[PDB]
Ligand binder design. Structure first.
Ligand code: PER
Ligand code: CU
Ligand code: CU
Ligand code: CU
Ligand code: CU
Lengths: 276, 73
């Protein structure tokens, strides 16, 4: 139950993570995570119901979605946990993350196709099935559409925001959640998707296994924010149309509330997490 | 009021948009698009990258597709 910085994994931990992800893909389970995410991407709107994105529940929703995925991985290999990618530190294409023994590198220039690593189309092990762009191979263009990942100073500026979220609880909000998500401000989470490119820039972004490592670090930033602001908690706290309040349950599970997901330590710890 | 309709050939492909709240097509295949509260737009193939107009979202989709047919959503 410890989520580790990807940069610190041993060779054996990398091998077991990759094998567990490839078995979820082979068995057909992986694609249904991709499909669930795209359905919420396409349905979450700023003036209507919104649960997984562009709303206060963006953070607990992805925390539970990542727990679902991690539990599926642990059904294949109980030793595996989700690692996280600190893109403020590992910010270039030579990060070991992008090595052939882990996620493979950037896509070639002609068609964005990833040519190395366990998820390259040539291996036969990573068909892209849930798609909108008709091509069936993993694609990336690292640093192609935006030229820098967030820096630590940018991340720190977001972590210093004391309010969790604010009315109107959407892509227009001020506050921590929307600055972490990235629709306002210097832009953390959305910019990372744009930086990776390929499927990560689309509503079928879990097609790239880096999706999970990106969201595990977003999830860690939520935990860091909590340590910086013990006097701040999830809002809204009751009676808000179209938005998941603190004690309301979330689709698609229907049986878990943001309140049940605020304390990550019920489920996992991090290799390191500053105390307040 | 919704944006105006448009119809043009962009990088060899026909892109169309029309009020419906708004629909976009690439070579006659509908492209899911969404409007943000601040008036910007995204599409399902560029869904973390706001652009100012639906025509800009259709153009961003053609750029993304690199010639590939769009699949219906
Ligand atoms: O949001 O992926
Ligand atoms: Cu998501
Ligand atoms: Cu959408
Ligand atoms: Cu994301
Ligand atoms: Cu204190």
């Amino acid at each position: 139950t410890v989520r580790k910085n990807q940069a610190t994994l041993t060779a054996d931990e990398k091998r077991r993570f990759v094998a567990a992800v490839l078995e979820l893909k082979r068995s057909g389970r992986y694609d249904e995570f991709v499909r669930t995410h795209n359905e919420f991407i396409m349905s979450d709107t700023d003036s209507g119901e919104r649960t997984g994105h562009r709303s206060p529940s963006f953070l607990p929703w992805h925390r539970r979605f990542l727990l679902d995925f991690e539990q599926a991985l642990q059904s294949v290999d109980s030793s595996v946990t989700l690692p996280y990618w600190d893109w403020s530190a590992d910010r270039t294409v030579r990060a070991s993350l992008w090595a052939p023994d882990f996620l493979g590198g950037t896509g070639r220039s002609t068609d964005g196709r990833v040519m190395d690593g366990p998820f390259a189309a040539s291996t036969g092990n990573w068909p892209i099935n849930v798609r909108v762009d008709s091509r069936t191979y993993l694609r990336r263009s690292l640093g192609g559409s935006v030229a820098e990942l967030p820096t630590r100073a940018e991340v720190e500026s977001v972590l210093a925001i004391s309010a969790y979220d604010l009315p109107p609880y959407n892509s227009a909000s001020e506050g921590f959640r929307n600055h972490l998500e990235g629709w306002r401000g210097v832009n953390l989470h959305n910019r990372v998707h744009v930086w990776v490119g390929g499927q990560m820039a689309t509503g079928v972004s879990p097609n790239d296994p880096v999706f999970w490592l990106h969201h595990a670090y977003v999830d860690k930033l939520w935990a860091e924010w909590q340590r910086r602001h013990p006097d701040s908690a999830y809002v809204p706290t009751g009676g808000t149309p179209d938005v998941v309040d603190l004690n309301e349950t979330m689709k698609p599970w229907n049986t878990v509330r943001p309140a049940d997901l605020l304390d990550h330590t019920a489920y996992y710890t991090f290799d390191a997490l500053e105390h307040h | 009021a919704a944006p105006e309709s448009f119809d043009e050939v962009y990088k060899g492909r026909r892109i169309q948009g029309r009020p419906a709240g708004y629909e976009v097509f690439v070579d006659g295949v509908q492209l899911h698009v969404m409007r943000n509260a601040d008036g910007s737009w995204i599409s399902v193939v560029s869904h973390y990258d706001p652009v100012p107009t639906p025509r800009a979202a259709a153009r961003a989709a053609v750029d993304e597709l690199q010639g590939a047919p769009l699949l219906p959503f």
